[PDB]
Amino acid sequence: DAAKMRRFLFQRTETRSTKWYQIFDTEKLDDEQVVGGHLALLGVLGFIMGIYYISGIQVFPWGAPGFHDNWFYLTIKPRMVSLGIDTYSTKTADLEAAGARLLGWAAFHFLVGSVLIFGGWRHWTHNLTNPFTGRCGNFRDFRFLGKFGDVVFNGTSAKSYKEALGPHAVYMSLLFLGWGIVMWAILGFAPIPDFQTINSETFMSFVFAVIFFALGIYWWNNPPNAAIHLNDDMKAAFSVHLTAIGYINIALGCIAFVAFQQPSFAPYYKELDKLVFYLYGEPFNRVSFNFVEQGGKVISGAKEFADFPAYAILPKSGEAFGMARVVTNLIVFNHIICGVLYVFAGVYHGGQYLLKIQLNGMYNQIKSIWITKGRDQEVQVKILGTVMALCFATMLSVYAVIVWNTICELNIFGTNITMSFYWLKPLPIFQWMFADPSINDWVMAHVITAGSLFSLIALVRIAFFAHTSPLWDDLGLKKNSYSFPCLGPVYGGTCGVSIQDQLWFAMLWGIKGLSAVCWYIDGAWIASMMYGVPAADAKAWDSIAHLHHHYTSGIFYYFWTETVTIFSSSHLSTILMIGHLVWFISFAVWFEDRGSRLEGADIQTRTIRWLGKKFLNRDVNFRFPVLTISDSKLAGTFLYFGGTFMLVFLFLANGFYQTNSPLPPPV
Amino acid sequence: RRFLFQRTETRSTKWYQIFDTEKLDDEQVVGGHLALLGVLGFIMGIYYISGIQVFPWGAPGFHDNWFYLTIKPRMVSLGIDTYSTKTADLEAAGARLLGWAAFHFLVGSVLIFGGWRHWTHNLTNPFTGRCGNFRDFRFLGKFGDVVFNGTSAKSYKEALGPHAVYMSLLFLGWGIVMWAILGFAPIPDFQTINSETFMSFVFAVIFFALGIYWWNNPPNAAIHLNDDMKAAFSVHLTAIGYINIALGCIAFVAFQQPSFAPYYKELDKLVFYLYGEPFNRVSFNFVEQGGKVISGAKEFADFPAYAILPKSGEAFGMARVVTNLIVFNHIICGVLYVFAGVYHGGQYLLKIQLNGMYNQIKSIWITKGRDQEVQVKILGTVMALCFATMLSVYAVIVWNTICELNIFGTNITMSFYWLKPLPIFQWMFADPSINDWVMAHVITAGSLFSLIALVRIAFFAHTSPLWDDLGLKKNSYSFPCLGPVYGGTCGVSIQDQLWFAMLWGIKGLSAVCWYIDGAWIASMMYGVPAADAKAWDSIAHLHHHYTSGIFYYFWTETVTIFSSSHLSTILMIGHLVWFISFAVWFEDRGSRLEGADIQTRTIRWLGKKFLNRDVNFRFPVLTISDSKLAGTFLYFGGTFMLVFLFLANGFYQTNSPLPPPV
Amino acid sequence: IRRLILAFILPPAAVMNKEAGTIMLTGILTLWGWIPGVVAALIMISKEQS
Ligand code: G2O
Ligand SMILES: CCCCCCCCCCCCCCCC(=O)OC[C@H](COP(=O)(O)OC[C@@H](O)CO)OC(=O)CCCCCCCCCCCCCCC
Ligand code: SF4
Ligand SMILES: [Ca+2]
Ligand SMILES: [Ca+2]
């Protein structure tokens, strides 16, 4: 009746809505519910760690062929060899012990995770009753553990988050000491301050246990004040800690990248190059079209090799396939992308809280420095403008250097590779942080700076212009939803001004500066777009710049080289197809086409209703829903970012192929 | 109420609308077409100049270029150029090319002069001093007395006829041009270029006899006469688009025929020195000087300095490369002209729906689709057929690739290797297979899929059943949206539907590119050594080895793009231009506007207390309409500057069906 | 003096007078190598005096 339809597209409208992906929004969660959710998720984390340990079994000591290699366990196998729970052992006898140890640790993780999940469930339901004693614990005022909960934290459980930092630090000191004693007792590894063995890990676990305990005492008796995070800790403290964890995670990725290449880490990562890996989905022993089983020996349709019966997964060496740095790059890039995403999400959730306090006037009611700074509307403009100017300068300089390098490679306009930026290396005072310092590393540093500033532009726009901007201050407008996609074509268009869309743009902009890491950690010569290509002079880089290594290929030729192995395997090929499929579908929701989709969905609804009557019968009242531009942007950011980083994984997991033999000039 | 229509109009004074039909009359259109044809003759002349290889006075000529290599088979067909390996014959070929280029310059100067002289409405003969009335004139003198007895065309429906006899005169004049200048007496032997002269005379007779009928019995289409600037232009533009698609198909079928072998197949028998191809690469310490090779000997002992290295026409199947270039150029131009004709027709349709004379139309071409329920049924059946065909063909492709890669333990014997076209359709193809069936169904799917947007343009130019039930109407044909209302109204104008039709036909046209390159669109992997993609030629019993699959098409046939500097530069520029379109297609215009105001305040802040004086300049941001226009051009150009690299890098579709790896 | 030593060591530390956004500029210039931050600190510490 034209109104029954109207309260159908008045159901996805980007007003304030339920938004199923916000059921666990911190606004409706209290402190104890957060504790319980984190405990349950840590229990599930223990469950999946046990699953990974099970996937690490190769002999099943009770007697059976084991699991094939997989990235889920290959990314942690060096750690388990470091802890002595797994082995790089060539013999079944020492591998049965590793299987037994992994099975026992998986069972232990299952038990501990079940306990942790049950505790988190009881915290989630506000049910801290001890079934053995029948009493009930008080979340607001509890003794921590007992006598230990009285000598330190003399009763008086923390009532505020700034008052909870200290007991948390003491809890983390307990964690460090517990891990140290677990090392010392279960895993051997007595604490020796020899910073070249795993014993140093136990020693530094005890050192950090002492440090964290003292710091927790100090912050228990002298709580610090960020002030504002105490009130809306659901979003303020949560987002600040999220961006802090993002920076910590980027730092951890850098630590992993530096450490896993050191000689002290050789028996755990570099020794992966002496192994042979049988990965799921890799090229299997193929057979002809007329295989008739009857094992022991093939009769009709001889397979590729007489060995590896039927459809066995073919071996691949760890030296040609650089599994050492493949695993290193997987771990490092995982933690780097997670850190970048956590920084972006912390800025976004902080902008959410900050718009919430700008809407109710609490923004002017903040006393802490962290907002009294940006409550200026000019220091906001100055900061964003100087970030944009620095991003413009760095990005323009580095991109023009890259384009000139590519021109000199291809000899466009009759140029030559000696006209390129082969001389532009890091300073000798900066050459210590690179191996084989060249224009590639200079370009990497400047591309990292440019991409970080490019994403920082949108991060600053989230931080400052959550509710209003100098443009929207000059106009008679204000932002009051953090998720509204637009106000319309007025002023030529107002698309994507909310902090959610600014988050999406920050993610898309950081895609470049983050994939630049994938090129780098794979050694892919981002200093030019066509490297190693035999066009004019791209193979002369190794001689003109006196390179010591030989990186894979330039930015564009990186999709030709090392894709020879993505295509060579079925699993990586189907991942490539799925990633590209997911990625381009984001155009259906980022392109300014939502109303076209709504109109076409109305047409399809009328068609299906009519097609359900001309041929079928009965009412066809079902109608096609269209994702609104808020939902369209959310789904599009997910589709785009996942589509690109399901294939950055393919670049990372297809091999290293960054040989240390600089090829001679073409001459 | 006539003011209201002018009041409620979007700004139509944009830089890409200065030559709009609504602000031109008949004679300015004549002048514009005449000047454009003069510049076109100038372009043909410079192409012929680029066709010289021996420079009749005696000198090395032009290196081969795609602009001239496209027309070289035709120029040889007319005898102006030759596939001769001796220098003396190329002397005459270059002399003929130079003479024809000079003739083109002269005729183009005359024709540009005429285009200017019509554009200014001053048709006065400079010698005898008389004038010429555009609305009433004698065509050529006694010719305009024997036919069109004193009078002239008062309307386009009365101009079809004189136009038809003008085209008959063009055919006849081309007949005498061939017969006299080029030899080629008109013989009804449809195996040589004599048949073209004979059919030129036949077409001259036919269009003359048809123009007489259309002058004596003018046709009745009515509505293309009143708002004749846009309605007739759009109808003729979509007609020319379909004609161009047909001509591309004609070229594809004909250029592989044995009769066209002396002009196209002989391209494989020559070596080509294309511009920007790998030259004689040189070492670092080269000094050339007078002794040539004093230090740092170059890549080849011959080919001094940086000479462009030869390229074989056999491995690089430039016969098929040139055929693909011409065919795909005409096909993409035809599809674009069809889309643009539907778009400009929707412009006229919204114009006549706004002013209320939509229901005053009597032609079936309007009344048939003026029901708002017949429109729904047509669009719904188009969407249903599109969904069915595309679901079937895409699931077939995905299943073929799954059976290739042996996902879920599947085997290539489970794929659609048996789904060839029916024998009554196998004459359409050489070596019919799943590739040809998938190609036909992909063409149907893409054509219907872009036809969805075309039909929405043709029907929902002013209102749609959804917008009827809402309190909304379309009145701009270029407006992007009505804001976040109803969850969003993005991209509902006919301009936006035209953009969607273009982006949707991008897939169905890349299908054409990959089929005419023999790139096995039947599956996403082929010739890749994963599980079974190299076993297609054996199980499917193929007589050809297609280049690769859909996804593997970017690895193979790119080894040659990379090996040349020019193709790599085109690749990089196309990718850059393509992804730049995201900055304007994404729902981000307001973000760009806010950031640009930040840029303005920064540039004026950095220029006031660090530089001096006002910095009044402010950064402009394309509006959503401008953003979508620029993004559609960036996307379409970025993809079809590299579809060119597909076409112009070799055929590599050898006839050796890759025995299975066992 | 003390402030020059602070600028050489921690250029943001010496420059706390100027602004809420200028201090980020000095800090990030210090992040890039160490010379840009020191140069900015000396430039804006000799600007209010000279
Ligand atoms: C994967 C590619 C795409 C489609 C598949 C598709 C399908 C589709 N689109 Mg689309 N689209 C883009 C991509 C795709 N758009 C892009 C990249 C842009 C940005 C330029 C874009 C833009 C617009 C605009 C502007 C409009 C639409 C529509 C419209 C609908 C038409 C309805 C119809 O006739 O049926 C046609 C529908 C089909 C043939 C679907 C059949 C399945 C098949 C087997 C493909 C499988 C789908 C997928 C690959 C697998 C995932 C499944 C999952 C389980 C893993 C129809 C659902 C329109 C409407 O919604 O209404 C008309 C509309 O207005 N779009
Ligand atoms: C008879 C008329 C025709 C009737 C039938 C026609 C309709 C049939 C259509 C069915 C299939 C539709 C074609 C596809 C439709 C299509 O391609 O358009 C995308 C589509 C949005 O479509 P709209 O809602 O605009 O319109 C589609 C309409 O057909 C009905 O909604 O959905 C998405 O945005 C997908 C994201 C869902 C959320 C997923 C987010 C990401 C999750 C994680 C996945 C990635 C992992 C991370 C990697 C980065
Ligand atoms: S194009 Fe879409 S997102 Fe942008 S202003 Fe219009 S309705 Fe809003
Ligand atoms: Ca890699
Ligand atoms: Ca080709």
PDB file of N, CA, C and O in Angstrom, chain A residues 59-97:
ATOM      1  N   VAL A  59      53.774 -37.636  14.589  1.00  0.00           N
ATOM      2  CA  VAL A  59      53.907 -39.084  14.735  1.00  0.00           C
ATOM      3  C   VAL A  59      52.797 -39.720  15.560  1.00  0.00           C
ATOM      4  O   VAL A  59      52.563 -40.935  15.427  1.00  0.00           O
ATOM      5  N   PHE A  60      52.063 -38.971  16.395  1.00  0.00           N
ATOM      6  CA  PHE A  60      51.007 -39.543  17.228  1.00  0.00           C
ATOM      7  C   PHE A  60      51.535 -40.721  18.037  1.00  0.00           C
ATOM      8  O   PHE A  60      51.248 -41.878  17.699  1.00  0.00           O
ATOM      9  N   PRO A  61      52.303 -40.465  19.109  1.00  0.00           N
ATOM     10  CA  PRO A  61      53.117 -41.517  19.746  1.00  0.00           C
ATOM     11  C   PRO A  61      52.428 -42.856  19.975  1.00  0.00           C
ATOM     12  O   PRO A  61      53.110 -43.881  20.080  1.00  0.00           O
ATOM     13  N   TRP A  62      51.096 -42.878  20.058  1.00  0.00           N
ATOM     14  CA  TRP A  62      50.403 -44.160  20.118  1.00  0.00           C
ATOM     15  C   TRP A  62      50.508 -44.935  18.811  1.00  0.00           C
ATOM     16  O   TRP A  62      50.220 -46.136  18.796  1.00  0.00           O
ATOM     17  N   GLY A  63      50.909 -44.279  17.725  1.00  0.00           N
ATOM     18  CA  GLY A  63      51.251 -44.946  16.484  1.00  0.00           C
ATOM     19  C   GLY A  63      50.275 -44.701  15.352  1.00  0.00           C
ATOM     20  O   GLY A  63      49.255 -45.388  15.242  1.00  0.00           O
ATOM     21  N   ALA A  64      50.606 -43.735  14.489  1.00  0.00           N
ATOM     22  CA  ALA A  64      49.864 -43.404  13.278  1.00  0.00           C
ATOM     23  C   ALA A  64      50.585 -42.286  12.534  1.00  0.00           C
ATOM     24  O   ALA A  64      51.296 -41.490  13.158  1.00  0.00           O
ATOM     25  N   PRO A  65      50.447 -42.201  11.214  1.00  0.00           N
ATOM     26  CA  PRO A  65      50.919 -41.005  10.513  1.00  0.00           C
ATOM     27  C   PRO A  65      50.265 -39.751  11.078  1.00  0.00           C
ATOM     28  O   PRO A  65      49.081 -39.746  11.418  1.00  0.00           O
ATOM     29  N   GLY A  66      51.048 -38.681  11.173  1.00  0.00           N
ATOM     30  CA  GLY A  66      50.628 -37.468  11.844  1.00  0.00           C
ATOM     31  C   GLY A  66      50.001 -36.434  10.931  1.00  0.00           C
ATOM     32  O   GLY A  66      49.522 -36.731   9.834  1.00  0.00           O
ATOM     33  N   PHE A  67      50.011 -35.191  11.407  1.00  0.00           N
ATOM     34  CA  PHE A  67      49.431 -34.068  10.683  1.00  0.00           C
ATOM     35  C   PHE A  67      50.405 -33.505   9.658  1.00  0.00           C
ATOM     36  O   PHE A  67      51.614 -33.437   9.897  1.00  0.00           O
ATOM     37  N   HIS A  68      49.864 -33.082   8.520  1.00  0.00           N
ATOM     38  CA  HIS A  68      50.650 -32.324   7.560  1.00  0.00           C
ATOM     39  C   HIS A  68      50.892 -30.917   8.088  1.00  0.00           C
ATOM     40  O   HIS A  68      50.141 -30.404   8.920  1.00  0.00           O
ATOM     41  N   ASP A  69      51.956 -30.290   7.595  1.00  0.00           N
ATOM     42  CA  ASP A  69      52.305 -28.955   8.053  1.00  0.00           C
ATOM     43  C   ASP A  69      51.252 -27.940   7.622  1.00  0.00           C
ATOM     44  O   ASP A  69      50.622 -28.068   6.569  1.00  0.00           O
ATOM     45  N   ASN A  70      51.060 -26.925   8.461  1.00  0.00           N
ATOM     46  CA  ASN A  70      50.131 -25.844   8.173  1.00  0.00           C
ATOM     47  C   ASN A  70      50.661 -24.572   8.812  1.00  0.00           C
ATOM     48  O   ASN A  70      51.426 -24.614   9.778  1.00  0.00           O
ATOM     49  N   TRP A  71      50.240 -23.430   8.264  1.00  0.00           N
ATOM     50  CA  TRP A  71      50.785 -22.157   8.722  1.00  0.00           C
ATOM     51  C   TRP A  71      50.390 -21.862  10.161  1.00  0.00           C
ATOM     52  O   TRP A  71      51.172 -21.251  10.902  1.00  0.00           O
ATOM     53  N   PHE A  72      49.195 -22.300  10.574  1.00  0.00           N
ATOM     54  CA  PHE A  72      48.763 -22.109  11.955  1.00  0.00           C
ATOM     55  C   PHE A  72      49.779 -22.676  12.935  1.00  0.00           C
ATOM     56  O   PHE A  72      50.066 -22.060  13.967  1.00  0.00           O
ATOM     57  N   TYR A  73      50.340 -23.847  12.636  1.00  0.00           N
ATOM     58  CA  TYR A  73      51.364 -24.405  13.505  1.00  0.00           C
ATOM     59  C   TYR A  73      52.782 -24.055  13.079  1.00  0.00           C
ATOM     60  O   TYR A  73      53.676 -24.056  13.929  1.00  0.00           O
ATOM     61  N   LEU A  74      53.025 -23.786  11.795  1.00  0.00           N
ATOM     62  CA  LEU A  74      54.379 -23.426  11.387  1.00  0.00           C
ATOM     63  C   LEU A  74      54.780 -22.058  11.917  1.00  0.00           C
ATOM     64  O   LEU A  74      55.974 -21.790  12.089  1.00  0.00           O
ATOM     65  N   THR A  75      53.808 -21.185  12.189  1.00  0.00           N
ATOM     66  CA  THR A  75      54.135 -19.876  12.739  1.00  0.00           C
ATOM     67  C   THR A  75      54.494 -19.943  14.218  1.00  0.00           C
ATOM     68  O   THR A  75      55.013 -18.963  14.760  1.00  0.00           O
ATOM     69  N   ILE A  76      54.227 -21.064  14.883  1.00  0.00           N
ATOM     70  CA  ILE A  76      54.582 -21.234  16.288  1.00  0.00           C
ATOM     71  C   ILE A  76      55.581 -22.355  16.519  1.00  0.00           C
ATOM     72  O   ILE A  76      56.077 -22.496  17.648  1.00  0.00           O
ATOM     73  N   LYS A  77      55.887 -23.160  15.503  1.00  0.00           N
ATOM     74  CA  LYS A  77      56.860 -24.236  15.671  1.00  0.00           C
ATOM     75  C   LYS A  77      58.230 -23.753  16.131  1.00  0.00           C
ATOM     76  O   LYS A  77      58.828 -24.422  16.992  1.00  0.00           O
ATOM     77  N   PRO A  78      58.796 -22.657  15.605  1.00  0.00           N
ATOM     78  CA  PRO A  78      60.067 -22.176  16.168  1.00  0.00           C
ATOM     79  C   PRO A  78      59.992 -21.881  17.655  1.00  0.00           C
ATOM     80  O   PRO A  78      60.959 -22.138  18.381  1.00  0.00           O
ATOM     81  N   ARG A  79      58.864 -21.349  18.132  1.00  0.00           N
ATOM     82  CA  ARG A  79      58.727 -21.082  19.559  1.00  0.00           C
ATOM     83  C   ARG A  79      58.720 -22.373  20.367  1.00  0.00           C
ATOM     84  O   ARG A  79      59.364 -22.457  21.419  1.00  0.00           O
ATOM     85  N   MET A  80      57.998 -23.391  19.895  1.00  0.00           N
ATOM     86  CA  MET A  80      57.950 -24.656  20.619  1.00  0.00           C
ATOM     87  C   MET A  80      59.287 -25.380  20.591  1.00  0.00           C
ATOM     88  O   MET A  80      59.629 -26.078  21.552  1.00  0.00           O
ATOM     89  N   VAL A  81      60.049 -25.240  19.507  1.00  0.00           N
ATOM     90  CA  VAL A  81      61.414 -25.747  19.521  1.00  0.00           C
ATOM     91  C   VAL A  81      62.261 -24.948  20.503  1.00  0.00           C
ATOM     92  O   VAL A  81      63.140 -25.503  21.174  1.00  0.00           O
ATOM     93  N   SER A  82      62.004 -23.643  20.614  1.00  0.00           N
ATOM     94  CA  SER A  82      62.711 -22.827  21.593  1.00  0.00           C
ATOM     95  C   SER A  82      62.398 -23.273  23.015  1.00  0.00           C
ATOM     96  O   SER A  82      63.292 -23.334  23.866  1.00  0.00           O
ATOM     97  N   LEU A  83      61.135 -23.594  23.290  1.00  0.00           N
ATOM     98  CA  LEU A  83      60.733 -24.049  24.614  1.00  0.00           C
ATOM     99  C   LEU A  83      61.039 -25.519  24.858  1.00  0.00           C
ATOM    100  O   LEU A  83      60.842 -25.995  25.981  1.00  0.00           O
ATOM    101  N   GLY A  84      61.507 -26.246  23.848  1.00  0.00           N
ATOM    102  CA  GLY A  84      61.754 -27.664  23.996  1.00  0.00           C
ATOM    103  C   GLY A  84      60.523 -28.534  23.917  1.00  0.00           C
ATOM    104  O   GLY A  84      60.604 -29.725  24.240  1.00  0.00           O
ATOM    105  N   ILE A  85      59.384 -27.979  23.504  1.00  0.00           N
ATOM    106  CA  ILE A  85      58.164 -28.764  23.367  1.00  0.00           C
ATOM    107  C   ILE A  85      58.053 -29.429  21.999  1.00  0.00           C
ATOM    108  O   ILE A  85      57.371 -30.456  21.872  1.00  0.00           O
ATOM    109  N   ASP A  86      58.714 -28.888  20.981  1.00  0.00           N
ATOM    110  CA  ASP A  86      58.809 -29.514  19.672  1.00  0.00           C
ATOM    111  C   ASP A  86      60.277 -29.573  19.273  1.00  0.00           C
ATOM    112  O   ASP A  86      61.133 -28.923  19.878  1.00  0.00           O
ATOM    113  N   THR A  87      60.573 -30.376  18.254  1.00  0.00           N
ATOM    114  CA  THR A  87      61.949 -30.612  17.842  1.00  0.00           C
ATOM    115  C   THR A  87      62.097 -30.464  16.338  1.00  0.00           C
ATOM    116  O   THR A  87      61.179 -30.781  15.576  1.00  0.00           O
ATOM    117  N   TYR A  88      63.261 -29.976  15.920  1.00  0.00           N
ATOM    118  CA  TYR A  88      63.711 -30.104  14.535  1.00  0.00           C
ATOM    119  C   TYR A  88      64.526 -31.381  14.363  1.00  0.00           C
ATOM    120  O   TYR A  88      65.656 -31.371  13.878  1.00  0.00           O
ATOM    121  N   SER A  89      63.938 -32.500  14.772  1.00  0.00           N
ATOM    122  CA  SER A  89      64.622 -33.781  14.817  1.00  0.00           C
ATOM    123  C   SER A  89      64.265 -34.618  13.597  1.00  0.00           C
ATOM    124  O   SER A  89      63.106 -34.682  13.178  1.00  0.00           O
ATOM    125  N   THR A  90      65.282 -35.262  13.031  1.00  0.00           N
ATOM    126  CA  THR A  90      65.148 -36.030  11.804  1.00  0.00           C
ATOM    127  C   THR A  90      64.623 -37.441  12.039  1.00  0.00           C
ATOM    128  O   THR A  90      64.323 -38.146  11.069  1.00  0.00           O
ATOM    129  N   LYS A  91      64.497 -37.869  13.292  1.00  0.00           N
ATOM    130  CA  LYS A  91      64.180 -39.253  13.612  1.00  0.00           C
ATOM    131  C   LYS A  91      62.841 -39.344  14.331  1.00  0.00           C
ATOM    132  O   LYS A  91      62.447 -38.427  15.057  1.00  0.00           O
ATOM    133  N   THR A  92      62.148 -40.463  14.108  1.00  0.00           N
ATOM    134  CA  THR A  92      60.831 -40.665  14.701  1.00  0.00           C
ATOM    135  C   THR A  92      60.914 -40.763  16.221  1.00  0.00           C
ATOM    136  O   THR A  92      60.018 -40.291  16.931  1.00  0.00           O
ATOM    137  N   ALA A  93      61.988 -41.370  16.738  1.00  0.00           N
ATOM    138  CA  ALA A  93      62.106 -41.580  18.179  1.00  0.00           C
ATOM    139  C   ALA A  93      62.041 -40.264  18.944  1.00  0.00           C
ATOM    140  O   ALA A  93      61.271 -40.134  19.903  1.00  0.00           O
ATOM    141  N   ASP A  94      62.838 -39.275  18.536  1.00  0.00           N
ATOM    142  CA  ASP A  94      62.783 -37.972  19.184  1.00  0.00           C
ATOM    143  C   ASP A  94      61.560 -37.171  18.764  1.00  0.00           C
ATOM    144  O   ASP A  94      61.272 -36.137  19.376  1.00  0.00           O
ATOM    145  N   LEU A  95      60.837 -37.621  17.738  1.00  0.00           N
ATOM    146  CA  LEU A  95      59.635 -36.915  17.319  1.00  0.00           C
ATOM    147  C   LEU A  95      58.388 -37.473  17.995  1.00  0.00           C
ATOM    148  O   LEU A  95      57.398 -36.750  18.151  1.00  0.00           O
ATOM    149  N   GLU A  96      58.421 -38.740  18.418  1.00  0.00           N
ATOM    150  CA  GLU A  96      57.343 -39.256  19.256  1.00  0.00           C
ATOM    151  C   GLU A  96      57.272 -38.499  20.575  1.00  0.00           C
ATOM    152  O   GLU A  96      56.181 -38.223  21.084  1.00  0.00           O
ATOM    153  N   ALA A  97      58.431 -38.164  21.147  1.00  0.00           N
ATOM    154  CA  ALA A  97      58.449 -37.376  22.375  1.00  0.00           C
ATOM    155  C   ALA A  97      57.866 -35.988  22.147  1.00  0.00           C
ATOM    156  O   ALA A  97      57.127 -35.472  22.992  1.00  0.00           O
TER     157      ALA A  97
END
